PDB file of C-alpha atoms and ligand atoms in Angstrom:
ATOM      1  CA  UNK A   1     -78.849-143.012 -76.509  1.00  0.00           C
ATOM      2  CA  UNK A   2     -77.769-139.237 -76.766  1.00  0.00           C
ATOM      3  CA  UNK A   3     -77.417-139.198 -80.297  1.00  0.00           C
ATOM      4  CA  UNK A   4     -75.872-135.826 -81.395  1.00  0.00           C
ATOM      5  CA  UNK A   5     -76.532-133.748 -84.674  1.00  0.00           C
ATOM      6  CA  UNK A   6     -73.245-133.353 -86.281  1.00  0.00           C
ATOM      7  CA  UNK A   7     -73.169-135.945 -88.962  1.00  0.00           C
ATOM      8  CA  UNK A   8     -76.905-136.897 -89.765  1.00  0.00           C
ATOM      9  CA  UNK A   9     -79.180-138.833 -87.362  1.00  0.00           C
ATOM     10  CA  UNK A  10     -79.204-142.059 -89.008  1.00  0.00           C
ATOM     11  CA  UNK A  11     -79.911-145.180 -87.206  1.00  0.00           C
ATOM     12  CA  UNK A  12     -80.998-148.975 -88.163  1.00  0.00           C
ATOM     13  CA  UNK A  13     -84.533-150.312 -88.083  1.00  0.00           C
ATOM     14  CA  UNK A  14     -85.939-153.509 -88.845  1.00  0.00           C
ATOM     15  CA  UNK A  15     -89.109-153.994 -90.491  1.00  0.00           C
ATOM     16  CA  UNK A  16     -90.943-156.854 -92.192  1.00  0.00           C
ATOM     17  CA  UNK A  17     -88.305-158.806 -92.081  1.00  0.00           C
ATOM     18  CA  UNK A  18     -85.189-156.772 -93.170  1.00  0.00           C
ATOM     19  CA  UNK A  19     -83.017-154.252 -91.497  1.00  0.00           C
ATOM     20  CA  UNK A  20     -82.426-150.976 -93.003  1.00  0.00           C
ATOM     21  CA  UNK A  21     -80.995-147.924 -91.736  1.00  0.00           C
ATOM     22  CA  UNK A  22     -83.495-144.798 -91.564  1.00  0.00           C
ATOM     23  CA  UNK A  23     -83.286-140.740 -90.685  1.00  0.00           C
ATOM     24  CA  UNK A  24     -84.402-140.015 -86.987  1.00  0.00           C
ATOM     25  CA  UNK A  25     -86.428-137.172 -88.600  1.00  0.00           C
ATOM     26  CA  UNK A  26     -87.983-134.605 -86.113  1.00  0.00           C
ATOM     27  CA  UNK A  27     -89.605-132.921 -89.266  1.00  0.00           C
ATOM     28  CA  UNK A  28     -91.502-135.629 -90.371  1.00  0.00           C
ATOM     29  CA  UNK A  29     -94.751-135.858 -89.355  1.00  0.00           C
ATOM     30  CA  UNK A  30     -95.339-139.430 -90.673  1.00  0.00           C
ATOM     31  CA  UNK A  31     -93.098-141.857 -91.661  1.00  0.00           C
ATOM     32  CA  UNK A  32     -91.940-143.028 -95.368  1.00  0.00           C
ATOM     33  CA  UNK A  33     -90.191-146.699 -96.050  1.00  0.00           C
ATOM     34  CA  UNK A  34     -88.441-146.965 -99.551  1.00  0.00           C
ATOM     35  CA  UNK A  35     -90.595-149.450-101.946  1.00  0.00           C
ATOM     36  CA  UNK A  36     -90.594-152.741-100.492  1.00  0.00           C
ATOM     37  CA  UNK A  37     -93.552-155.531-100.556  1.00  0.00           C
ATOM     38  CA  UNK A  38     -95.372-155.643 -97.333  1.00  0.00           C
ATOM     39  CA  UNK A  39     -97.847-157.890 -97.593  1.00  0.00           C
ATOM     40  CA  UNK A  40    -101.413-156.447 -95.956  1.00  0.00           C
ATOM     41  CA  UNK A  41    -104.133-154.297 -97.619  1.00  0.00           C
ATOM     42  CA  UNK A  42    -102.795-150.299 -98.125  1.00  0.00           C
ATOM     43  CA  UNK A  43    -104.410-147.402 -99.441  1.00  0.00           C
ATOM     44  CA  UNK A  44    -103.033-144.537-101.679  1.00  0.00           C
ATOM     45  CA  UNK A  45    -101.782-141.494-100.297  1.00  0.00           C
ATOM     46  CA  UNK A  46     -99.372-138.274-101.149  1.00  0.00           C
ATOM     47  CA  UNK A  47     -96.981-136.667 -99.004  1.00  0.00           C
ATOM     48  CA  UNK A  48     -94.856-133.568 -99.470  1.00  0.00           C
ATOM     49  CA  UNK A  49     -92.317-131.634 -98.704  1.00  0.00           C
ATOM     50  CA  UNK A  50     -89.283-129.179 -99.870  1.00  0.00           C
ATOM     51  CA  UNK A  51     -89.770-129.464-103.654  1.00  0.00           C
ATOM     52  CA  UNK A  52     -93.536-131.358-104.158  1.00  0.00           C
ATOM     53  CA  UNK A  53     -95.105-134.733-103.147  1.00  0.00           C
ATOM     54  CA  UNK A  54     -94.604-137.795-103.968  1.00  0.00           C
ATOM     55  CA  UNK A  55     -97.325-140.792-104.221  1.00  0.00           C
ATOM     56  CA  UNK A  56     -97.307-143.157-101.274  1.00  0.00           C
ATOM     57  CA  UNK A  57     -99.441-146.002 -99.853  1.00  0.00           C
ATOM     58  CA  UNK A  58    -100.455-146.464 -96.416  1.00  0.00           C
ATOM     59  CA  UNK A  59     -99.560-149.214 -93.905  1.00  0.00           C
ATOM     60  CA  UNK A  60    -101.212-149.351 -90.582  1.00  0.00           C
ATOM     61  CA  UNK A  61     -99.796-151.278 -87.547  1.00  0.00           C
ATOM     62  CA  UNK A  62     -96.524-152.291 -88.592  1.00  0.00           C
ATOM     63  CA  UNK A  63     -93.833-152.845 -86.685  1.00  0.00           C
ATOM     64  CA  UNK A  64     -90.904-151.727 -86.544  1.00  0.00           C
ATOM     65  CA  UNK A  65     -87.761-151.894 -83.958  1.00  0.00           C
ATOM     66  CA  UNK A  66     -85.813-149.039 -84.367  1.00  0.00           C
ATOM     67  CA  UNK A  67     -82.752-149.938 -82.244  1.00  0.00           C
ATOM     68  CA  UNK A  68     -84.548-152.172 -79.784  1.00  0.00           C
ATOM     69  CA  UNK A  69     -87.001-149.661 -78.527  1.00  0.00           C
ATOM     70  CA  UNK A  70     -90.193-151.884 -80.995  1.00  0.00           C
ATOM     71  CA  UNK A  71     -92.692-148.990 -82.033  1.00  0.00           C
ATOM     72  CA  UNK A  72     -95.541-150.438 -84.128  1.00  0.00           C
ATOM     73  CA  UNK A  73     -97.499-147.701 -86.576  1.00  0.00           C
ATOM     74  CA  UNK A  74     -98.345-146.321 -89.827  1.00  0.00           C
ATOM     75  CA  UNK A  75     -95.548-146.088 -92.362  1.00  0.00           C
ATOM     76  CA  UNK A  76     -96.067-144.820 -95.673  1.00  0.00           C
ATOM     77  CA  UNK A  77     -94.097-147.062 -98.649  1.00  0.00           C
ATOM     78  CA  UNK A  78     -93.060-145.280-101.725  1.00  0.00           C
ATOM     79  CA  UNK A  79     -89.617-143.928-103.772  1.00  0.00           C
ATOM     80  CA  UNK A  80     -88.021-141.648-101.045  1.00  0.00           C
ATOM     81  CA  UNK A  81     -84.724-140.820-101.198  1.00  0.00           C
ATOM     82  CA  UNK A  82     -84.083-141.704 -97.348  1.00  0.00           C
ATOM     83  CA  UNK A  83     -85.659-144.056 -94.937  1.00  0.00           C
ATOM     84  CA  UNK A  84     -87.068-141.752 -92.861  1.00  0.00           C
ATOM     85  CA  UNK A  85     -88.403-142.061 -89.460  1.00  0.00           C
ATOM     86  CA  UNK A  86     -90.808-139.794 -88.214  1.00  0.00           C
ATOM     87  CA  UNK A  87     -92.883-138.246 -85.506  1.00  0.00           C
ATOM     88  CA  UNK A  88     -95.249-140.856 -85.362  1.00  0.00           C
ATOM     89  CA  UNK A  89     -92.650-143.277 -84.069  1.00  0.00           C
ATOM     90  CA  UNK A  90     -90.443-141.500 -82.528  1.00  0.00           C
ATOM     91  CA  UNK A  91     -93.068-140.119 -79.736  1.00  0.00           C
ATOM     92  CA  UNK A  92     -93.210-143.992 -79.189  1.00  0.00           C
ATOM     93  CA  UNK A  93     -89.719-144.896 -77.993  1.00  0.00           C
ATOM     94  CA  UNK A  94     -90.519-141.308 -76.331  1.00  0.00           C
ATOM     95  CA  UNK A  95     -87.527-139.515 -78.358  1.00  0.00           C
ATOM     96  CA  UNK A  96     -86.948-135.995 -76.744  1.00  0.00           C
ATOM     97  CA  UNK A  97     -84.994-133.442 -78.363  1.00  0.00           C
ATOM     98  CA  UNK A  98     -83.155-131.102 -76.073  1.00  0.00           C
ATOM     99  CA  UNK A  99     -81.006-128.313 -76.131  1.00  0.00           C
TER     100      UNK A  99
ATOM    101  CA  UNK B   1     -86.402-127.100 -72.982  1.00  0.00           C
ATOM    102  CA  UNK B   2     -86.599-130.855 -73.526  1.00  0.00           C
ATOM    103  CA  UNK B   3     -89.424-131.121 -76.706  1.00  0.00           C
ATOM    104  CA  UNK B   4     -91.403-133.850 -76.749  1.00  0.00           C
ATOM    105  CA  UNK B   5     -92.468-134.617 -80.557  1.00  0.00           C
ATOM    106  CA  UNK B   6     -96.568-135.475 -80.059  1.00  0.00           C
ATOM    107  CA  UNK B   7     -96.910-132.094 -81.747  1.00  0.00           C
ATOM    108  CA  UNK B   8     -94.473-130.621 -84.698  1.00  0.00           C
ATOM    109  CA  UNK B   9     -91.325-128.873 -83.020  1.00  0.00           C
ATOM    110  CA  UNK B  10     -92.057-125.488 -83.407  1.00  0.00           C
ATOM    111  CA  UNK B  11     -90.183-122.795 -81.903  1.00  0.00           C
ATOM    112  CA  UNK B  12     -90.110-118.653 -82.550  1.00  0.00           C
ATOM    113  CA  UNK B  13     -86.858-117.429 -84.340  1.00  0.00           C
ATOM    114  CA  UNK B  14     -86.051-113.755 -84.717  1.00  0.00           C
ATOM    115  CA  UNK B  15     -84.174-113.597 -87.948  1.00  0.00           C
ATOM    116  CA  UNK B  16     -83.412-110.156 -89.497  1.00  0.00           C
ATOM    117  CA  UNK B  17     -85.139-108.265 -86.284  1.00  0.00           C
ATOM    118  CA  UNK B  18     -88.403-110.499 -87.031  1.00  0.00           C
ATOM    119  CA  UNK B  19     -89.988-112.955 -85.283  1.00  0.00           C
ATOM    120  CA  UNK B  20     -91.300-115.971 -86.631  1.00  0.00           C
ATOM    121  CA  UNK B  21     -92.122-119.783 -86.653  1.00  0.00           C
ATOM    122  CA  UNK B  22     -89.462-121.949 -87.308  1.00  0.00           C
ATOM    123  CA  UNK B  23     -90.013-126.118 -87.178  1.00  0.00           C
ATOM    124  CA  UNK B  24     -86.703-127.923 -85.431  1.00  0.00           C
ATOM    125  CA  UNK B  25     -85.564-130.173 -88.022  1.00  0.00           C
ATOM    126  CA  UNK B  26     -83.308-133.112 -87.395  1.00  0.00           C
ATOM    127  CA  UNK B  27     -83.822-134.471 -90.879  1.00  0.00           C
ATOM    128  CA  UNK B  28     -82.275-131.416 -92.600  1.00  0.00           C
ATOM    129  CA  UNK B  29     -78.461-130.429 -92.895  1.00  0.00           C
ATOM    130  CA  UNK B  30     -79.662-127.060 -93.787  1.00  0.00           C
ATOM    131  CA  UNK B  31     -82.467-124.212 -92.451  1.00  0.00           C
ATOM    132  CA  UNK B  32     -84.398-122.798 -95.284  1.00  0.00           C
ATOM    133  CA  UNK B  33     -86.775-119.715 -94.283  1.00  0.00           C
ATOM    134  CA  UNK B  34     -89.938-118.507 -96.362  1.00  0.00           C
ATOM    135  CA  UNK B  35     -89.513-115.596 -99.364  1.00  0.00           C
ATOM    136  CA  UNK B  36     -87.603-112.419 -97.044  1.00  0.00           C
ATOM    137  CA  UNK B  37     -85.374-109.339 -97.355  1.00  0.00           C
ATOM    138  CA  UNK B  38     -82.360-110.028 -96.028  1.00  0.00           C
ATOM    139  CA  UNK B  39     -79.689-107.873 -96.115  1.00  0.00           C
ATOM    140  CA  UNK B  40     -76.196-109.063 -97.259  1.00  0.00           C
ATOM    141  CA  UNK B  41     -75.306-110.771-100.669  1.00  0.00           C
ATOM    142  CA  UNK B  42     -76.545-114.040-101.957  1.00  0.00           C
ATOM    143  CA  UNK B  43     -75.411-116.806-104.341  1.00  0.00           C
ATOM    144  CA  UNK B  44     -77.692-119.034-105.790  1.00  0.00           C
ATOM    145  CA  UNK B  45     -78.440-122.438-104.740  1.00  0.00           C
ATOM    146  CA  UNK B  46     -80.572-125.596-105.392  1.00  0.00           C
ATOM    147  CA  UNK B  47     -81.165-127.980-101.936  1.00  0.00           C
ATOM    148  CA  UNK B  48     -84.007-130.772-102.700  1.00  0.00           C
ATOM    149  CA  UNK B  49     -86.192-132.620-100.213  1.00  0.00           C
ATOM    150  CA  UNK B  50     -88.410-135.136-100.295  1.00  0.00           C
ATOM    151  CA  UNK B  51     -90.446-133.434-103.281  1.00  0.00           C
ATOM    152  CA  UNK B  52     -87.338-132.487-105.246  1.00  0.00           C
ATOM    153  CA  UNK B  53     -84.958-129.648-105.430  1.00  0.00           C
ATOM    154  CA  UNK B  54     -86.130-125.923-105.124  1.00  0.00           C
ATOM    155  CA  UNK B  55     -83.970-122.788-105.654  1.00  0.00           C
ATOM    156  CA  UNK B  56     -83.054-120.667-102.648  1.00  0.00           C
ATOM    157  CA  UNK B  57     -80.643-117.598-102.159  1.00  0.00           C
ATOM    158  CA  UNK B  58     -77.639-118.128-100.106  1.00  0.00           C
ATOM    159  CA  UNK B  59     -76.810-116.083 -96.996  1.00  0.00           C
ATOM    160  CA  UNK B  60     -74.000-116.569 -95.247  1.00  0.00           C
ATOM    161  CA  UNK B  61     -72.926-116.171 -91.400  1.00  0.00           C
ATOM    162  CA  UNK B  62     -76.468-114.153 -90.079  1.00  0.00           C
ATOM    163  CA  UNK B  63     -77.350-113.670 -86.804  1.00  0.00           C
ATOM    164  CA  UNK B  64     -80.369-115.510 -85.687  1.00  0.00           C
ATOM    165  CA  UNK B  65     -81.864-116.285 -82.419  1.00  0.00           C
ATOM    166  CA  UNK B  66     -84.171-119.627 -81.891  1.00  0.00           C
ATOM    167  CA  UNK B  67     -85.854-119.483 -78.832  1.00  0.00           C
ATOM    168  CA  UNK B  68     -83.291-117.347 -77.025  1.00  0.00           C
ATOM    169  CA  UNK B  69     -80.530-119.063 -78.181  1.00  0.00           C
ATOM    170  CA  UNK B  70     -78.141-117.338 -80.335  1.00  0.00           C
ATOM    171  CA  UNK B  71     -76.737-118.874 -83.843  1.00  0.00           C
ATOM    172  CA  UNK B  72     -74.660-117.441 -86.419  1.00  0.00           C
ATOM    173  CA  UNK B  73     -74.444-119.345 -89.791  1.00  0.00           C
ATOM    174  CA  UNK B  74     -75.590-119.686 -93.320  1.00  0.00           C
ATOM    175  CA  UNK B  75     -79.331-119.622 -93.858  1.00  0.00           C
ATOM    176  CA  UNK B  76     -80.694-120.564 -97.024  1.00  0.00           C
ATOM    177  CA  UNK B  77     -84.082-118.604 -98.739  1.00  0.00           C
ATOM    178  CA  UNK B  78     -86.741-119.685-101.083  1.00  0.00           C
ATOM    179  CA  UNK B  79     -90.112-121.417-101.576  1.00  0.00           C
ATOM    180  CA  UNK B  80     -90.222-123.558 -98.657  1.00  0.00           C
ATOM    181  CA  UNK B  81     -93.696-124.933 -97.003  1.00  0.00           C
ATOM    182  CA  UNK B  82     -92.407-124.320 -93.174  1.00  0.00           C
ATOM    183  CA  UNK B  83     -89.731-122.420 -92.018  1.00  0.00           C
ATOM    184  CA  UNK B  84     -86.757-125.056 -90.660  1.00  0.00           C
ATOM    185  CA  UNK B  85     -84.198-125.381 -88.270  1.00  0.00           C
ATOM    186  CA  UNK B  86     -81.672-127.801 -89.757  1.00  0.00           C
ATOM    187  CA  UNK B  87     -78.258-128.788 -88.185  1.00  0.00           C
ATOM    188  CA  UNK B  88     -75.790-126.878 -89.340  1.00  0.00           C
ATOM    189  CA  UNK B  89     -77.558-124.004 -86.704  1.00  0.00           C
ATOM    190  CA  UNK B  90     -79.207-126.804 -84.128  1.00  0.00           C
ATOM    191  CA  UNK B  91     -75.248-128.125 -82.892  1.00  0.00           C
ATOM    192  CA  UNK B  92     -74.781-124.240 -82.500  1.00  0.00           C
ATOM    193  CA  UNK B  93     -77.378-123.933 -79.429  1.00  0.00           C
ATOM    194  CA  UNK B  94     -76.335-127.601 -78.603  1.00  0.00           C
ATOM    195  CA  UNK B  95     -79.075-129.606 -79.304  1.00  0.00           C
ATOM    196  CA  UNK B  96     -79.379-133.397 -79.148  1.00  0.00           C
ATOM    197  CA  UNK B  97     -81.932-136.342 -79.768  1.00  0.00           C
ATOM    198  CA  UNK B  98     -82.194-138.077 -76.275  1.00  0.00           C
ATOM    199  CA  UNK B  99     -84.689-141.664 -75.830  1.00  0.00           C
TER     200      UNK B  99
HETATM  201  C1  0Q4 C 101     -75.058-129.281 -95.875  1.00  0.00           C
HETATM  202  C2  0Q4 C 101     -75.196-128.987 -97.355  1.00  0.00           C
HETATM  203  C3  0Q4 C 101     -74.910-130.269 -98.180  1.00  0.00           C
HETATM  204  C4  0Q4 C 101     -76.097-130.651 -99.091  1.00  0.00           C
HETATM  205  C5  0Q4 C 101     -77.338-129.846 -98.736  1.00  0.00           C
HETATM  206  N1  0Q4 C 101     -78.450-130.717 -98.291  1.00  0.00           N
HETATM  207  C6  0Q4 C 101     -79.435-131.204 -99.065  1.00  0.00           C
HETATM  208  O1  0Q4 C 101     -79.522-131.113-100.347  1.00  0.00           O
HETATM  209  C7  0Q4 C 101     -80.414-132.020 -98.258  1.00  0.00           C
HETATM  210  C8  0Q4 C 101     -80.319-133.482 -98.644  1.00  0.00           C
HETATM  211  N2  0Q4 C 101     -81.829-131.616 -98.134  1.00  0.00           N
HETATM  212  C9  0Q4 C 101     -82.359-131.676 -96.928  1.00  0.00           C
HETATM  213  O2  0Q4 C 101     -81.641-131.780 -95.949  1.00  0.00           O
HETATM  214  C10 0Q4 C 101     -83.810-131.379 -96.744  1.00  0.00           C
HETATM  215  C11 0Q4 C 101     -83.889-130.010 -96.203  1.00  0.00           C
HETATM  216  C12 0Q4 C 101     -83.379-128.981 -97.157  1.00  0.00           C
HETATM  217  C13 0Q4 C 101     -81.897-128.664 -96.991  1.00  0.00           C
HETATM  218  O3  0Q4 C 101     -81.082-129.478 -96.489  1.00  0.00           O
HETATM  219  O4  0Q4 C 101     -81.546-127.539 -97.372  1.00  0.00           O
HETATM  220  N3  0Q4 C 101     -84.390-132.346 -95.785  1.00  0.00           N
HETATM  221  C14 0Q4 C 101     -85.602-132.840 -95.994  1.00  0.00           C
HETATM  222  O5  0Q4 C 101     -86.271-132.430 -96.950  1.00  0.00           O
HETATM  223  C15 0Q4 C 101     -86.257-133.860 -94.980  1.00  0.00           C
HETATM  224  C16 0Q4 C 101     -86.271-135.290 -95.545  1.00  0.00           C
HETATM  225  C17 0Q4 C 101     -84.950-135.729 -96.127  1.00  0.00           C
HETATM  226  C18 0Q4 C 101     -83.878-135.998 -95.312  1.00  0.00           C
HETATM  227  C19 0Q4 C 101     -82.596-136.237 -95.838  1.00  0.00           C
HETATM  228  C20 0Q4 C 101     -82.402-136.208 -97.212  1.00  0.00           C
HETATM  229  C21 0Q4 C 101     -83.489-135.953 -98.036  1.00  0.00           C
HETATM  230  C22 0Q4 C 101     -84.755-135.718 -97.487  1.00  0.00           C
HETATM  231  N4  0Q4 C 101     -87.661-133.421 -94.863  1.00  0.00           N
HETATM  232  C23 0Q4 C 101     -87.999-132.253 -94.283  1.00  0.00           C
HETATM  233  C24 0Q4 C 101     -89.482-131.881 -94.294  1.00  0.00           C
HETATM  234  C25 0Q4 C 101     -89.792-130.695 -93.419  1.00  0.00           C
HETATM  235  C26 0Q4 C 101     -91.299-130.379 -93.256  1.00  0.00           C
HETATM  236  C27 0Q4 C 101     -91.519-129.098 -92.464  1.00  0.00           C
HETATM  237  C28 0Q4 C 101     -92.027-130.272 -94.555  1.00  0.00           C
HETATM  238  N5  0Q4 C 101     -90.432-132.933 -94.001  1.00  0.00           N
HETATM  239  C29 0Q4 C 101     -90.959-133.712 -94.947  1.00  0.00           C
HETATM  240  O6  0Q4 C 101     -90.605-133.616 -96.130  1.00  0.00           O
HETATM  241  C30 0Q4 C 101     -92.032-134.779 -94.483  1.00  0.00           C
HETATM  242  N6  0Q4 C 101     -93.394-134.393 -94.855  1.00  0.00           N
HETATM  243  C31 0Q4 C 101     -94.285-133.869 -94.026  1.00  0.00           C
HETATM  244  O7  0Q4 C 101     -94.025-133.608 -92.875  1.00  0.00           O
HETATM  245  C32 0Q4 C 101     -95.672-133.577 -94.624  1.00  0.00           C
HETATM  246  N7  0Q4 C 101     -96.875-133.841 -93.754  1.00  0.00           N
HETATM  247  C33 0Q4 C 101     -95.728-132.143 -95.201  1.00  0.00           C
HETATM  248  C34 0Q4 C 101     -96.723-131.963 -96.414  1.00  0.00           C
HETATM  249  C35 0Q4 C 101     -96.305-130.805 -97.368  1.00  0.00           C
HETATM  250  N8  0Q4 C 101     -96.770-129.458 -96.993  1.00  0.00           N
HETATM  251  C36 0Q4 C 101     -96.242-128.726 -96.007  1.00  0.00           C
HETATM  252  N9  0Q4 C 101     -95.229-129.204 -95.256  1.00  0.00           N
HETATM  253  N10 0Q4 C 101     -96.674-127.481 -95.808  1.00  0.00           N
HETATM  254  C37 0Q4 C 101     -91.777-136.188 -95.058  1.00  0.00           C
HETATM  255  C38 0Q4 C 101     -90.407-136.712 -94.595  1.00  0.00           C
HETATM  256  C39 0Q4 C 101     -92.938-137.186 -94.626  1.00  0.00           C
HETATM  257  C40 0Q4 C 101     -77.561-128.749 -99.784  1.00  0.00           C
HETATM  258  N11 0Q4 C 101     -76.727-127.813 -99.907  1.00  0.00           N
HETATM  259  O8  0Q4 C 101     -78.590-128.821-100.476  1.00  0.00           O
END
């Protein structure tokens, strides 16, 4: 895919076992699932951004399939707004961004 | 330039006859710069992220250059962490998410 910028980047993942639909974000460094029970051990973490942070727990070595192109990583779970997918995936299915 | 995202995105902007950092954002339908003089009238605004919402001066249709590239559009100011590049500016110098 050339996906291009003029309505938001969003895109569907699957993880666990559901399929969602998350923000190819190139300004996320890690990535941050909405609340959903993933079995596995976590830890607790806090992430931030425009306006504070928020409290999240860690997952390591998950997968997930964004689009067919499986990454498998650390994704943070917690109340965000947007699915987001970040940096630490998106090197994975070796997203580019060019201009 | 093709960007590869194993490091954060960031590129040099001239804004207002200054150079600075500016991360490429994908993930943002606006570009928010750091506390500046800029000249031209602003209105108020309140854009939230994943923190919350934050309150940055408006600035419509200013000339701005990211890494060569020339852009002319509105460009929000306030109390953000990292300078960003959102979309509204990143379509103008034709950028696109390629994997
Ligand atoms: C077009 C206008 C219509 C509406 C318009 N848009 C908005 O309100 C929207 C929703 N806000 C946004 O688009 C904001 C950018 C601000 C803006 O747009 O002005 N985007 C965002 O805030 C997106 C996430 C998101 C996406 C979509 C919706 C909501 C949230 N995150 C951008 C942000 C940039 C980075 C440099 C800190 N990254 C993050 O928040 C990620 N965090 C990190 O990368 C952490 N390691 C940083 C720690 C904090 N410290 C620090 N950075 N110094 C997080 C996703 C793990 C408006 N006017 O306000």
């Amino acid at each position: 895919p050339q996906i291009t910028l003029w309505k938001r980047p969003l895109v569907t993942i699957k993880i666990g076992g559901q399929l969602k639909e998350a923000l190819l974000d190139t300004g996320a460094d890690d990535t941050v699932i909405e609340e959903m029970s993933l079995p596995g051990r976590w830890k607790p973490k806090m992430i931030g951004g425009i306006g504070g942070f928020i409290k999240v727990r860690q997952y390591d070595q998950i997968i997930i399939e964004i689009c067919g192109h499986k990454a498998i990583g650390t994704v943070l779970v917690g109340p965000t707004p947007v699915n987001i997918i970040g940096r630490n995936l998106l090197t994975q299915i070796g997203c580019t961004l060019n201009f």
